[PDB]
Amino acid sequence: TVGAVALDLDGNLAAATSTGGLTNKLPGRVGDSPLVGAGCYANNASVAVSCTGTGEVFIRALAAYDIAALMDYGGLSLAEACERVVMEKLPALGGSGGLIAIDHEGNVALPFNTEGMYRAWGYAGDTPTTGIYRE
Amino acid sequence: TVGAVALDLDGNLAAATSTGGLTNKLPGRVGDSPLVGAGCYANNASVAVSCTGTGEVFIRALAAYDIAALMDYGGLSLAEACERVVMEKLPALGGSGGLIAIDHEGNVALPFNTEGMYRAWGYAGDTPTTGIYRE
Amino acid sequence: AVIAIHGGAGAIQMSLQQELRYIEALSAIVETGQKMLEAGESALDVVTEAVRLLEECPLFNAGIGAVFTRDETHELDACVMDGNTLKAGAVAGVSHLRNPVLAARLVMEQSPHVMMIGEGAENFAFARGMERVSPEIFSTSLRYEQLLAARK
Amino acid sequence: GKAVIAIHGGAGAISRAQMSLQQELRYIEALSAIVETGQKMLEAGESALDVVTEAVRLLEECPLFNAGIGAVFTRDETHELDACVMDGNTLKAGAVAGVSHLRNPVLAARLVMEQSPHVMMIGEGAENFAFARGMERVSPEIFSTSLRYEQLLAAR
Ligand SMILES: [Cl-]
Ligand SMILES: [Mg+2]
Ligand SMILES: [Mg+2]
Ligand code: NA
Ligand code: NA
């Protein structure tokens, strides 16, 4: 699974997710990656999210839109919504993985509950940061 | 599309949606009906929803989970959440259709913004109500 | 304890006796679901059976009486979700399964997956003894006529 | 708010006690080159939607990542690819699942968003829609890498 989230100079949010799925996967199995609000969501009012992990749980918990709904309706910050979703609700359902999120206000978050998440981010005009492990 | 939502004597919620899709769809087209939180959602913490209508808008608006999220995070009643989703947000995106919803306390709602929605409901040990047109 | 069902929303022209076929259908299915709830059947079994009956009923755009694709074929989609476990099962783009909601339930019950598509979905079902059917069995005069009308 | 991109190439038990520093740096330079390309587009006033499409196209192309080229294998030793893209502006979205003959699923997803009235297409239908919009057909074997095949054999 791979993903991208962006906030542009127009203040537009977008999200993309692509995957080959799971090694040895049962043919015809679909995880969260192609499913709007499971593995991929973007709304100028809230957040752009792309997800990676145990796709069944990301679907059941509608992880991507749940970030959006926690922020928009719950009044959570991106940080709060990310913690709630990735560190609490997804583990609660036996979901492992993480996601990348940018909100309408230009906050970026890259939560994961796994050992690693191949990730990077950068502000336009700034030096980018890359990561694999925690810390 | 057809649908069912139920609350059982154990206080459990379930939802189901089945459909042929939209007449004259491109082969390979998927609407909201098989998409968790688009056309079908159930959570004992909130609500069981099954949807019918412009599937593309139901997916983009994540209609079913948005009822759940408006109730659970927004503190709306089922009625308020149904009105907000079906009568405001789905039309706002040019979505036409409706849905059936039962909340964890056994409140039932059958909103639609179309001319008709083939529908019925009935409390266990009570006589059922059927409908086609508005009211 | 309570059930609701729907047979689709849209631009619903009609006589009382035409309307009453839809009403008697809806009434019989909601009543079947009502009886199960009263008898202590699970919400998940009740919504499965109601939607299975709505599939079987040729009046409604699900299983028998499905709309047609542009290629005059049927491609059916279903979902079922258990609000207790938050388990869900779903099939999309299946043409050889009489009751997509039963296929969905099978995906929920006898895989670790939530969604299966197309021949993968079908082979999964066949492998667990669900019967293969030819897509022609869903075909009705009324939905074909609506396809011709959609063309113009 | 001020313009920004994030990318990922998947979460999992990526463990230090399996990866060498040299392996880790290939992942870091990959991530770095792609986020920088996305950063240059944002700075140049390119849209979030164009920026996330290109970043994911680059992540698909990169065989280090389980998307497009370097996709894992199914039980049948096939590739089945899935993508979504969503435009936060319009709330339009496009998605493919179960596609084996489209080099860049995220481009197919974009095509579903931009040149159909649908949000999601699956399988041969997804592919025929894409071919009929002039997207090129490819061999499923182009995504096949020695690494992912070996991982399949190790899983079984
Ligand atoms: Cl009526
Ligand atoms: Mg641009
Ligand atoms: Mg490969
Ligand atoms: Na039917
Ligand atoms: Na790749």
Residue numbers in the entry:
A (entry chain BBB), B (entry chain DDD): 179 to 313
C (entry chain CCC): 4 to 15, 19 to 158
D (entry chain AAA): 2 to 157
Paper text:
The Escherichia coli enzyme EcAIII catalyzes the hydrolysis of L‐Asn to L‐Asp and ammonia. Using a nature‐inspired mutagenesis approach, we designed and produced five new EcAIII variants (M200I, M200L, M200K, M200T, M200W). The modified proteins were characterized by spectroscopic and crystallographic methods. All new variants were enzymatically active, confirming that the applied mutagenesis procedure has been successful.
